[PDB]
Design a protein around this motif. Structure first.
Motif, PDB file in Angstrom:
ATOM      1  N   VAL A  64       3.349  43.890  63.413  1.00  0.00           N
ATOM      2  CA  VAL A  64       2.494  44.889  64.049  1.00  0.00           C
ATOM      3  C   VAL A  64       1.360  45.266  63.106  1.00  0.00           C
ATOM      4  CG1 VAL A  64       2.332  47.255  64.963  1.00  0.00           C
ATOM      5  CG2 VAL A  64       4.408  45.862  65.394  1.00  0.00           C
ATOM      6  N   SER A  89       1.273  41.152  73.592  1.00  0.00           N
ATOM      7  CA  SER A  89       1.304  42.119  74.671  1.00  0.00           C
ATOM      8  C   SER A  89       0.073  42.998  74.533  1.00  0.00           C
ATOM      9  CB  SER A  89       2.597  42.942  74.630  1.00  0.00           C
ATOM     10  OG  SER A  89       2.798  43.509  73.359  1.00  0.00           O
ATOM     11  N   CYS A  90      -0.178  43.840  75.529  1.00  0.00           N
ATOM     12  CA  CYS A  90      -1.316  44.757  75.507  1.00  0.00           C
ATOM     13  C   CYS A  90      -1.135  45.847  76.541  1.00  0.00           C
ATOM     14  CB  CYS A  90      -2.614  44.019  75.815  1.00  0.00           C
ATOM     15  SG  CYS A  90      -2.675  43.302  77.477  1.00  0.00           S
ATOM     16  N   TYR A 158      -1.997  53.164  67.178  1.00  0.00           N
ATOM     17  CA  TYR A 158      -1.127  53.091  68.351  1.00  0.00           C
ATOM     18  C   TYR A 158      -0.958  54.483  68.967  1.00  0.00           C
ATOM     19  CZ  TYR A 158       2.709  51.751  71.409  1.00  0.00           C
ATOM     20  OH  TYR A 158       3.524  51.527  72.503  1.00  0.00           O
ATOM     21  N   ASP A 179      -6.063  46.533  75.615  1.00  0.00           N
ATOM     22  CA  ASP A 179      -5.990  46.948  74.216  1.00  0.00           C
ATOM     23  C   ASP A 179      -4.726  46.470  73.515  1.00  0.00           C
ATOM     24  OD1 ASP A 179      -4.373  48.932  75.604  1.00  0.00           O
ATOM     25  OD2 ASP A 179      -4.720  50.286  73.956  1.00  0.00           O
ATOM     26  N   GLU A 180      -4.885  46.035  72.269  1.00  0.00           N
ATOM     27  CA  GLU A 180      -3.763  45.685  71.417  1.00  0.00           C
ATOM     28  C   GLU A 180      -4.166  45.978  69.961  1.00  0.00           C
ATOM     29  OE1 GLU A 180      -6.225  43.169  70.525  1.00  0.00           O
ATOM     30  OE2 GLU A 180      -4.394  42.182  69.793  1.00  0.00           O
ATOM     31  N   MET A 181      -3.631  45.254  68.971  1.00  0.00           N
ATOM     32  CA  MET A 181      -3.789  45.671  67.565  1.00  0.00           C
ATOM     33  C   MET A 181      -4.177  44.576  66.570  1.00  0.00           C
ATOM     34  SD  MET A 181      -0.697  48.450  67.287  1.00  0.00           S
ATOM     35  CE  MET A 181      -1.310  49.240  65.804  1.00  0.00           C
ATOM     36  N   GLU A 182      -4.356  43.334  67.018  1.00  0.00           N
ATOM     37  CA  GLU A 182      -4.511  42.202  66.077  1.00  0.00           C
ATOM     38  C   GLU A 182      -5.601  41.160  66.383  1.00  0.00           C
ATOM     39  OE1 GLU A 182      -1.481  42.899  67.748  1.00  0.00           O
ATOM     40  OE2 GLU A 182      -0.287  43.818  66.153  1.00  0.00           O
ATOM     41  N   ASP A 204       1.932  45.478  79.406  1.00  0.00           N
ATOM     42  CA  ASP A 204       3.192  46.227  79.635  1.00  0.00           C
ATOM     43  C   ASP A 204       3.033  47.738  79.906  1.00  0.00           C
ATOM     44  OD1 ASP A 204       2.836  47.303  77.036  1.00  0.00           O
ATOM     45  OD2 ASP A 204       4.322  45.985  76.139  1.00  0.00           O
TER      46      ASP A 204
ATOM     47  N   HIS F   5       9.509  51.740  68.663  1.00  0.00           N
ATOM     48  CA  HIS F   5       9.547  50.650  67.682  1.00  0.00           C
ATOM     49  C   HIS F   5      10.795  50.663  66.794  1.00  0.00           C
ATOM     50  CE1 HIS F   5       5.362  50.932  68.993  1.00  0.00           C
ATOM     51  NE2 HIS F   5       5.319  49.630  68.764  1.00  0.00           N
ATOM     52  N   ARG F  43      11.756  44.240  65.597  1.00  0.00           N
ATOM     53  CA  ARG F  43      10.544  43.728  64.969  1.00  0.00           C
ATOM     54  C   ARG F  43      10.751  43.775  63.446  1.00  0.00           C
ATOM     55  NH1 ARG F  43       5.727  43.365  67.953  1.00  0.00           N
ATOM     56  NH2 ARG F  43       5.919  43.904  70.177  1.00  0.00           N
TER      57      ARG F  43
HETATM   58  N1  LIG Z   1      -3.157  49.550  70.600  1.00  0.00           N
HETATM   59  C1  LIG Z   1      -2.159  49.307  71.504  1.00  0.00           C
HETATM   60  N2  LIG Z   1      -1.536  48.089  71.510  1.00  0.00           N
HETATM   61  C2  LIG Z   1      -0.555  47.858  72.425  1.00  0.00           C
HETATM   62  C3  LIG Z   1       0.316  46.689  72.692  1.00  0.00           C
HETATM   63  C4  LIG Z   1       0.333  45.323  72.064  1.00  0.00           C
HETATM   64  N3  LIG Z   1       1.060  45.033  70.815  1.00  0.00           N
HETATM   65  C5  LIG Z   1       2.422  45.607  70.732  1.00  0.00           C
HETATM   66  C6  LIG Z   1       2.602  46.049  69.278  1.00  0.00           C
HETATM   67  C7  LIG Z   1       2.824  47.554  69.209  1.00  0.00           C
HETATM   68  O1  LIG Z   1       3.912  47.919  70.075  1.00  0.00           O
HETATM   69  C8  LIG Z   1       1.352  45.610  68.529  1.00  0.00           C
HETATM   70  O2  LIG Z   1       1.576  44.408  67.779  1.00  0.00           O
HETATM   71  C9  LIG Z   1       0.290  45.407  69.611  1.00  0.00           C
HETATM   72  C10 LIG Z   1       1.131  47.079  73.762  1.00  0.00           C
HETATM   73  N4  LIG Z   1       0.861  48.358  74.144  1.00  0.00           N
HETATM   74  C11 LIG Z   1      -0.127  48.881  73.389  1.00  0.00           C
HETATM   75  C12 LIG Z   1      -0.849  50.169  73.299  1.00  0.00           C
HETATM   76  O3  LIG Z   1      -0.568  51.107  74.066  1.00  0.00           O
HETATM   77  N5  LIG Z   1      -1.814  50.304  72.367  1.00  0.00           N
END
Ligand SMILES: Nc1nc2c(CN3C[C@H](CO)[C@@H](O)C3)c[nH]c2c(=O)[nH]1
Ligand SMILES: Nc1nc2c(CN3C[C@H](CO)[C@@H](O)C3)c[nH]c2c(=O)[nH]1
Ligand SMILES: Nc1nc2c(CN3C[C@H](CO)[C@@H](O)C3)c[nH]c2c(=O)[nH]1
Ligand SMILES: Nc1nc2c(CN3C[C@H](CO)[C@@H](O)C3)c[nH]c2c(=O)[nH]1
Ligand SMILES: Nc1nc2c(CN3C[C@H](CO)[C@@H](O)C3)c[nH]c2c(=O)[nH]1
Ligand SMILES: Nc1nc2c(CN3C[C@H](CO)[C@@H](O)C3)c[nH]c2c(=O)[nH]1
Lengths: 230, 230, 230, 230, 230, 230
Positions: A64, A89-90, A158, A179-182, A204, F5, F43
């Motif tokens: 993450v 995922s996003c 997040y 939206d996601e993080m990477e 999701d 998480h 994770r």
């Molecule tokens: N920024 C963000 N990313 C995600 C993701 C996608 N990934 C899921 C994981 C955090 O749960 C990260 O590696 C990014 C799912 N839901 C969300 C959200 O609400 N926000």
């Protein structure tokens, strides 16, 4: 000569690499392939050699978040990877259109990280490779899986708080899809290191059948791209 | 109801628009088409309705630089344009590879302007539409014209000075291909306004035959895209 | 040895230059003079040698927006111009006081561009030359034309959007008088290149008789300043 | 109803105020006047009512540095001051031209502070009032005292260190004349509060006779401006 | 060899220095000590050698605001000071908890200045020395004086205006305890120059008995720390 | 009601939590304790309830990098954690002094991340809780383990590149002691959420016996702090 975090050697790195966040997803993916070889598992970085449709490519977890995935991507990019696809995922930024379970193939990303900015000025675009993007879309098409296309907001936050407003609504108004993080981090590192990148994501929030489809698309794309280097 | 700067009406705006910097280039382009209708010429903004391969699309000049071209692009995007392709010139940022006269079809750009940042946060990517990009590459292919692909640095500074170093060398090291002054602005405005954008550029620094080729590619792409809305 | 964009030589550049945005305005101005010589017209840059009250000075169009006008100003400043006055239009930021048709002679500007910042740090002021400012005010006085004085917001965004709020209201509260798109850029380039600059503007939003007056003031000021170098 | 830091009342504030950094300089100035009345001395803020050439105006010390002088200037500007002139010292940024003992009358300043930026966006210019500037230059002229004119770098850093390079050399290349610590702050506060400001400075680094001259110029200007409100 | 602003020599600088904003407070403090020696008074910088509980340490005023106090702190830090404690006033950012007259011993600060940023990147923390902090808390404890602990917002803006919102409410939500104008600057300079720093503050807004207590704590801490260098 | 998480419930969260980057280190730590209960592993986040010196506290892995650890810290801080100590590795920024195997207990950090800045303005300090810091130092003292103290650079960039220079040398000159990737993020989140934080780090670059010592210090500190809530 073993990579510091991945704990695999340069020789084990294939031209094409499929990356995911969760080391658990690497195990779910490897069993979908024709065969596999477990290579290493260190910290959050799980590495497996996948065998699919006659081709060989790694599947590696990146953890993450941007700073942690940059470590993974740099190790791959500086030791022979030519193509890296992120399957993730996003959340949806267009909730009326893009719903839970939908799949989005992304061409570009918002750089709401820090590491990309420590590598190159903020004005530089986070953009994927067109051929990778095209390949992903064409695999979805031949598997008759509807997909969306668009820009992802890659954010290091997040969990927002109530002092500094989140820019997500702004980016939704700007027509960002998900939206996601990477992904932004992957894209920028790839451009700088001459590695072709792409991203396919399953929504999701804001179906395991759809996950299955998404995985087949990603594996299909990896095999197609792997043929260009074999 | 005439647009403030273009001095054409909403009714005269076609789904596809070809934009160029120099009003002089609009006149060189219109004579390559099967026929044309001169519409307006106000300030640096010259507008002509082009007729090519059975399709109808505007060719409009946008002037030198981001703030001036944004005026053009906003007027087009807010009054019915669906696709805008920029056909321009550029310098090479990879002088060993990309030479004078070479043609580059660009997928993304560095936002070294101000207006894009007054519209949306700097982290947002300047990225072109994939289909437009694909169409341009496929027209080049069928005309057997070699092209490069890559990122353009869109900079508001034509003439550097010796106090603040130019970021061009940084962006060359980052694998940006070429530099010009408008593409990032087009891309960002297009994304925000749901208009599909692209860019094809001819290198002149750091052949009129190559200009001819570039123009044929751009006109070919415009006609192909115009068929989707006719 | 012809300037790249203006397409005139260093020898044709006079000590004093009157700049305007619209090449059309150059033609309206030249006929007010005692005589003129058309020099060049390339892209949006129209150049004419004006003869007025026994003095010789150029009138040159710079186009809409900062990046495009910087090209003009750099070419002038690096090839012998000593004084550049901008005669332009603007919007009012003090609608109760400064009305449509009013004339404002500006001493300084808000740098809402990019090119000035690519030349020198943002903390540096965009400020006009006092003598130029004084000369403009004294010509207005002897022609008995009421004028306002104040700061102009020079913004690269003509058309705001609804994601990032415009700073115009902030600058109105800060007592900025008017807004346009080029004066800050002129001022900063002038300071850096040791060229004396100024600005006179006519409000059209938020009378051709007032335009006539404004033009007479600008031409009067140019001739007065030209005598110091003849 | 006494001002928090100056410890004088609104009634004691004159239309014109002469400000200096050192409370010691207020005492050296007051004895040059025709008469004076000591008003208050609190912290670094010494206030004296000066009587000169038939006019009445305050002389007030503001201390070293922008945050401390802003307190002084806000108290003055929000309680009736109409004109504030700063008479200060400075370093030369053009050592071949502007020498120790030379006097510079400044029209604008570089905002290398923080407080101006907490009041208004960085793009806003720190600029003095033209009439104040003109008045100062005309007093110097009638006293036959040579002066320079130019921009001051107002920096919050007196003592540089060797990690982050100082921008002084950059600003010297940009044609800034001198450097001190307060003028930009005065100028911005004045503009925001509709108070006319100016600055006259004596170079001491990079003659008490020249100090005497500078003081006479400043006192002469204050009296001239005071007549407009009496 | 006399320090430029303090007008004392290196030989007069003690290992421990107590700093305050108001030169008036230096005079109120010195009479609480067992004896003292007046050293210098130049501009806002008053310096006195204090004798307390068998130890020798300076008490020096630094003026209002970051740029002015930086001058003081640099002169001290570069000429032998090892420990600098700031004894100041402040406003409360937690008005339900921290009331007028309460005392706060601060471990860190918000860098809302400019000078710290001209010395080191903004990401660097303004943090006090732990031993100094511990010593201050232990003196309060043995004198049975209740104190608060927390972060101070050091802001260059005493008087907010209504264009750019103040960040004070944000910082209150972030759990900052108090606000003043100098502590962050002290902390950053100390870290860079290997000088141990701390801060004790008395709330006056948003009792001279509490001031007395605060002074005893500060003097007690200075003497304790002075023993480590004697 | 399971944390998203960590996959543990609010009820399983203890007042004191020991965090580490590597889930592998959680397993090495739990066997040093008197007993333990494995709670979850999802994770990169491994959670174990540790039993040591009569007290109960969690040990949880946070992964590599700021965005990923923020997820962990927010989940802990918003569900009852009162004290979080990070036990990590780091590089030395003072290679002549702080050597491989040395232990550093950190009071503050450089915020070279993004997530802290998406929560609160950059001027806000990343600072640890004093009591936590004191407790860590006192455990080291009673175990007769030499330690260093100082500031950590928390950077999102593990692998620098050659376009944008790394700020590490700057921060070394500024007297930062060590560098890692998470402590600043922990500190800022803790301050915002009223959770007391700290950090103890072992240098490995720029001895498993020293790791053992470091772990004993961290476990000793956790038990001591846990007694305040039991
Ligand atoms: N920024 C963000 N990313 C995600 C993701 C996608 N990934 C899921 C994981 C955090 O749960 C990260 O590696 C990014 C799912 N839901 C969300 C959200 O609400 N926000
Ligand atoms: N920034 C930049 N752009 C260009 C271009 C492309 N366009 C040409 C025109 C300026 O001559 C602008 O509209 C951009 C050619 N050469 C160069 C160069 O050296 N620099
Ligand atoms: N920014 C801005 N400029 C102007 C101007 C002045 N010039 C007119 C032209 C755009 O129409 C530019 O060269 C600037 C008139 N109205 C406006 C306005 O509403 N906004
Ligand atoms: N920034 C700066 N200011 C000055 C000044 C002018 N003032 C003198 C005083 C600091 O000594 C401040 O109020 C500003 C003289 N020399 C210098 C210098 O070298 N630097
Ligand atoms: N920023 C700020 N500081 C203070 C202080 C503390 N010091 C008092 C003095 C200004 O009056 C400066 O040296 C800082 C008291 N009240 C306030 C306030 O309301 N705001
Ligand atoms: N930034 C940085 N961190 C570390 C660390 C500390 N942690 C080790 C891990 C990356 O290997 C992160 O969780 C941070 C060890 N060496 C280094 C280094 O050279 N750099």
């Amino acid at each position: 000569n073993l990579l510091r975090h991945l704990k695999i050697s340069k020789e084990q790195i294939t031209p094409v690499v499929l990356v995911v966040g969760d080391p658990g997803r690497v195990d779910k993916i490897k069993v979908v392939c024709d065969s596999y070889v477990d290579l290493a598992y260190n910290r959050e970085y799980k590495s497996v050699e996948c065998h699919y449709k006659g081709q060989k490519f790694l599947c590696v977890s990146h953890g993450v978040g941007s700073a942690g995935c940059a470590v993974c991507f740099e190790e791959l990019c500086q030791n022979g990877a030519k193509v890296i696809i992120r399957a993730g995922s996003c959340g949806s930024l267009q909730p009326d259109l893009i719903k839970r379970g939908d799949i989005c193939i992304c061409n570009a990303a918002v750089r709401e990280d820090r590491v990309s900015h420590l590598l190159i000025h903020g004005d530089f675009p986070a953009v994927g490779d067109f051929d990778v993007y095209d390949t992903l879309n064409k695999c979805a098409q031949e598997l008759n899986v509807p997909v969306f296309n668009g820009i992802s907001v890659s954010s290091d936050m997040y969990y927002p708080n109530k002092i500094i407003p989140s820019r997500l609504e702004d980016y939704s108004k700007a027509n960002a899809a998900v939206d996601e993080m990477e992904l932004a981090t992957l894209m920028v590192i790839g451009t700088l290191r001459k590695v072709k990148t792409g991203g396919i994501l399953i929504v999701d929030g804001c179906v395991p059948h759809q996950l299955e489809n998404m995985i087949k698309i990603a594996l299909g794309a990896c095999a197609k791209l792997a043929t260009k280097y074999a």
